[PDB]
Amino acid sequence: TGLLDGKRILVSGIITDSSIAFHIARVAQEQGAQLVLTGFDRLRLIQRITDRLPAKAPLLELDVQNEEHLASLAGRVTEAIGAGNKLDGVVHSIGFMPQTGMGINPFFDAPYADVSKGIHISAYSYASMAKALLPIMNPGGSIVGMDFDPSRAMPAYNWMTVAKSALESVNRFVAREAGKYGVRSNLVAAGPIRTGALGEEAGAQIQLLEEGWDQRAPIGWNMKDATPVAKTVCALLSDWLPATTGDIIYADGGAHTQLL
Amino acid sequence: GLLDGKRILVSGIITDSSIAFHIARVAQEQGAQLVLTGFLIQRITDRLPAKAPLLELDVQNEEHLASLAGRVTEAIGAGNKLDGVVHSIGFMPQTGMGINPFFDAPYADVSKGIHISAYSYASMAKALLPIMNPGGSIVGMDFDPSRAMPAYNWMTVAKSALESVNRFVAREAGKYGVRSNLVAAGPIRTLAMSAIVGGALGEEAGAQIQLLEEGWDQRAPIGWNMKDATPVAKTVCALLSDWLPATTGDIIYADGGAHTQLL
Amino acid sequence: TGLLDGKRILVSGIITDSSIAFHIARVAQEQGAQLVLTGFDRLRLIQRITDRLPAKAPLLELDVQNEEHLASLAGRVTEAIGAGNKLDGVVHSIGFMPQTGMGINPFFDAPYADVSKGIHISAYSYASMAKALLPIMNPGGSIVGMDFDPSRAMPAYNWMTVAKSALESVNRFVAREAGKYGVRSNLVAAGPIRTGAQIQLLEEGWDQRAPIGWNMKDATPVAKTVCALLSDWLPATTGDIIYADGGAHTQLL
Amino acid sequence: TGLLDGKRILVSGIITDSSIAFHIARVAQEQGAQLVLTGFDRLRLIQRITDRLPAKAPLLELDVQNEEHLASLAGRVTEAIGAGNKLDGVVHSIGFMPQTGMGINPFFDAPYADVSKGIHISAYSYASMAKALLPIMNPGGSIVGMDFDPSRAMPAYNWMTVAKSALESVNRFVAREAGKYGVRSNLVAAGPIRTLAMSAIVGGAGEEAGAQIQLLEEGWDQRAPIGWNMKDATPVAKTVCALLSDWLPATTGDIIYADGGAHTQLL
Ligand SMILES: NC(=O)c1ccc[n+]([C@@H]2O[C@H](COP(=O)([O-])OP(=O)(O)OC[C@H]3O[C@@H](n4cnc5c(N)ncnc54)[C@H](O)[C@@H]3O)[C@@H](O)[C@H]2O)c1
Ligand SMILES: NC(=O)c1ccc[n+]([C@@H]2O[C@H](COP(=O)([O-])OP(=O)(O)OC[C@H]3O[C@@H](n4cnc5c(N)ncnc54)[C@H](O)[C@@H]3O)[C@@H](O)[C@H]2O)c1
Ligand SMILES: NC(=O)c1ccc[n+]([C@@H]2O[C@H](COP(=O)([O-])OP(=O)(O)OC[C@H]3O[C@@H](n4cnc5c(N)ncnc54)[C@H](O)[C@@H]3O)[C@@H](O)[C@H]2O)c1
Ligand SMILES: NC(=O)c1ccc[n+]([C@@H]2O[C@H](COP(=O)([O-])OP(=O)(O)OC[C@H]3O[C@@H](n4cnc5c(N)ncnc54)[C@H](O)[C@@H]3O)[C@@H](O)[C@H]2O)c1
Ligand SMILES: CNC(=O)CN1CCN(C(=O)C[C@H]2CC[C@@H](NC(=O)Cc3sc4ccccc4c3C)CC2)[C@@H](Cc2ccccc2)C1=O
Ligand SMILES: CNC(=O)CN1CCN(C(=O)C[C@H]2CC[C@@H](NC(=O)Cc3sc4ccccc4c3C)CC2)[C@@H](Cc2ccccc2)C1=O
């Protein structure tokens, strides 16, 4: 008997087998969930990756910047799961920020066109996905999105931090709408996951930043392992956190609760 | 079950309306083997679906705390350890919460309230961590004290202290591969809460506590049922399980999402 | 002998005499500051409003969505204050969110083009203004922006709440850059000020929660708070938020 | 023509000229405030220290654990400032946690009697002082207490962190009461300042606690976008005076961070 036995769950965001969404999908299938997967742009490449999951699952195209894909999504999901069936879970594991808004580029040098594209994909799309899928979600259902704690500024993350701050606010509003359907909406704020290319300076800054989690975390933090993050997402998709919504669960080894 | 084969200590049962009674019931339904602590309680624990040894524990008693691990080992058998610990203990004299002005609470009463409600979370962890397995979990009960509110007064201060204690307990528990977290629940109609709504503290506090309570279901996007402790007991069992393995020194809100909404 | 004696301060965001920026400008002039004002679109109309201030101040055009206005801003400010002089303070009091993402319109019905415009003007522009003006700011200087506490969701504010959450994050990054110039960056989170039914109930719960009360018709306590941050009296506060809300955010009920 | 011209302000917590309260008192006097000072236990020693301030000020005894000192406080202050006059400001700059509740001693080994004494002095006393002084405070008045950000756990501060978490909660309740008098109540969360206790902890008086607190200080100046000078209490004293002034009239039950902005940055 699995944690998600009989649940129908949509999982977005698989691009490689290192994607957090790949591990979420794997754990959900191990726990008896029946999945529907969504992918962006390189669909034939994504299918070769989803072939590595323990079970078969239909793969649907979804570019969150495409209004036609969003308008047809519910109909395409209904065709995949069968008429009369609805989703119990939705996973948003999508993020993007051009190199001008994240990395080595000065914070002030990111043009708004790049920042806006990043915010569209990383934050606004959480509301777009909920709008498209809530009409085909069962009561007791659960929408989960991926977050990286943006309460404090940090080197390199720059405008992606701003996109996460916007995402946390979007999640609180999505919870108000999802509540009308008896559906929960929450984010999982993960520690860094290893999903010299940017030089010596940024490479060192990012290494110190990332090594700080394992030192601060009372139970440690393994950047090579997405499984504890995938398990946390599955806990929110389950019936075991039924009174949590518009909220953030931290799967970061407890690093955010410690100063040093 | 979610907790199949897990050995879990549950404190805080006094009546069958206690949040700890519901936590214990759900944990047994989910396959856990329990050890109960109390400080008349055996007649209540007889109502649980399965038998469980009941040990005496007054958290203000240093002798009870010093002997606790040995008494638990005797109950579960030599060579066996605990996988979970539940702290569901709270107390504040009437001088520190209710109708009494905030400034009129003498320190002796506030201190006793803080000892039982906050310091004892560290005391319980100190006594039980030496007999806990790696991957283990310690969970305590909280009521969001980030903002002041009518009547809760010094109990709000005790919860603010408890949240801080939890972050330090996580540092110690980490050495054993054990997590420590609090569940911040919405209001639940336990014995005291039903008496206050019933008018035991008068018309003024009765009305203030009723507005405090009604605003909760209004703010919660999924609603809030103060008569039902099951969503809170399920949340505690989620933290006792292997499904939140990277969460520690933290707070999970089982409040219908009320704390995320202004209006 | 005022709080801001001799300080050169830029103030954006005046449109009417009920604008929070109008009250900030008035209090700053009363406290001895020499101002430079910026306005958007209706400059002749804005000019007539700024004549109501106690002292004369040059008015410059600034549409924060206009890259040419931003590129020329420092030069235009230098012409207004004189060569060799720099700013000690910058006030960002700008916000906008198209009707689809604010009010009665469902949260899900706001198209991204409207949300993006709102975020550009309300949040990204705080970084744009700091980028343009930090090269003409003196050490010990202060950048202040206006915020409305977005830590919890609420009725009607909808996508403007999302823009404020983005603004708070932008402020923390602007502080990292401003620090290089010995300049502070902070936001003032104000209670509601008079500048449908749900907006009235939301706005009114504020005076109820506030331990010192809240007067939505009076912008002076907010203007005084902004001037406190522009002064030399909060020299160790940056990337932060000061709440001028009657203490409403500290109380549940 | 000072920021606090004509204001009558009570300042507690002076023990040495390194005390944050000494710098608060100095800046307040430079800004035209008329002070009343309170001292604990070593009053002859405290009088020699307060002699170093730019202006004379009456020194009153106040042990916050002493109910008789608290009951007589308002009358003693009234006698010092003159009948018919009231206070405009109150500064709480008091803290203590017995040795077992800090540094080298394991967090689990601090007995409750020590923790309770520490909480009494460091948190409950903020309510005690407000209870005693609000009846002799003018509208527009301000109560300010000193805090050290306890939102996250950290090495060595141990039970003193717990006392600060309790203090932040007490401040929110004090604001509800102070509001009835038209009085504000707020805390200033300061960055680390090399006072006598701070220098001793870094000095190893355990080695491990000294090493961790050295790391805490280094990181603070690193994280702070405007930097942090632990040898300079003046920015902290200025922030307290800003709250005592008429320039933050709509802020109450709140926390102002005078920490160089370090709490707003991860790295
Ligand atoms: N990796 C970490 O350290 C970390 C930490 C915390 C949170 N997260 C978050 O987890 C999520 C997944 O990131 P990841 O680390 O697995 O990286 P990833 O590159 O594997 O996943 C990002 C996904 O976004 C998809 N995407 C981009 N543009 C899209 C569009 N227009 N339409 C639809 N999908 C689009 C990509 O195709 C990809 O599958 C993101 O939200 C990320 O911010 C990551
Ligand atoms: N609305 C609510 O009921 C509510 C909301 C959120 C959290 N909580 C928390 O949940 C926990 C349980 O409260 P409850 O509502 O079930 O009430 P309860 O009265 O049933 O439980 C409190 C328990 O504390 C025990 N206790 C008191 N002093 C003790 C001592 N010296 N030693 C050992 N145990 C002692 C009592 O015996 C009792 O079992 C508390 O921490 C409470 O603050 C309750
Ligand atoms: N009024 C309140 O209740 C309240 C509460 C908290 C914070 N605030 C904030 O204070 C600020 C000022 O708002 P207000 O209430 O004074 O209203 P306002 O309408 O008087 O001012 C908003 C200003 O933004 C300007 N603006 C719009 N588009 C612009 C553009 N492209 N370029 C430059 N400027 C542009 C407008 O011209 C106007 O001057 C905003 O950031 C607002 O969110 C207001
Ligand atoms: N030093 C720092 O790094 C730092 C940082 C942030 C906040 N603070 C806070 O500032 C405040 C002042 O501390 P400090 O660093 O200036 O140290 P300090 O030792 O100079 O001041 C502490 C004061 O508390 C007094 N006190 C102790 N027990 C008392 C009692 N029973 N009754 C009355 N007064 C009593 C002492 O006499 C002393 O004057 C404390 O609340 C402290 O926690 C200090
Ligand atoms: C058709 N409208 C237009 O042509 C342009 N226009 C003008 C006003 N407008 C704005 O963007 C105004 C702008 C909002 C942000 C900022 N003001 C605030 O932050 C103050 C608010 S507005 C609001 C609304 C609901 C709840 C709280 C608050 C609070 C605290 C500056 C002024 C928007 C949204 C709008 C539409 C109709 C009625 C009211 C608003 C807009 O579309
Ligand atoms: C032998 N000493 C005694 O009997 C009495 N005594 C005096 C000083 N004492 C206090 O409680 C001093 C008090 C602490 C709280 C407060 N100071 C601070 O909060 C400043 C600190 S101390 C510290 C330690 C670690 C991390 C941060 C900080 C910060 C920010 C006022 C002064 C304690 C603990 C102590 C002992 C020796 C050296 C240093 C401390 C104490 O036991």
PDB file of N, CA, C and O in Angstrom, chain D residues 132 177 231 262:
ATOM      1  N   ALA D 132       4.845  49.806  35.640  1.00  0.00           N
ATOM      2  CA  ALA D 132       5.217  50.813  36.622  1.00  0.00           C
ATOM      3  C   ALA D 132       5.239  52.236  36.057  1.00  0.00           C
ATOM      4  O   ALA D 132       4.813  53.166  36.748  1.00  0.00           O
ATOM      5  N   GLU D 177      -1.161  47.648  25.701  1.00  0.00           N
ATOM      6  CA  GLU D 177      -1.398  48.428  26.924  1.00  0.00           C
ATOM      7  C   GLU D 177      -0.967  49.874  26.756  1.00  0.00           C
ATOM      8  O   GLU D 177      -1.702  50.791  27.135  1.00  0.00           O
ATOM      9  N   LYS D 231      32.780  47.599  17.520  1.00  0.00           N
ATOM     10  CA  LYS D 231      33.404  48.451  18.549  1.00  0.00           C
ATOM     11  C   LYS D 231      32.670  49.795  18.682  1.00  0.00           C
ATOM     12  O   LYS D 231      33.035  50.619  19.531  1.00  0.00           O
ATOM     13  N   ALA D 262      22.501  43.189   8.176  1.00  0.00           N
ATOM     14  CA  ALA D 262      22.966  41.788   8.130  1.00  0.00           C
ATOM     15  C   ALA D 262      21.837  40.725   8.147  1.00  0.00           C
ATOM     16  O   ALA D 262      21.979  39.690   7.484  1.00  0.00           O
TER      17      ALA D 262
END
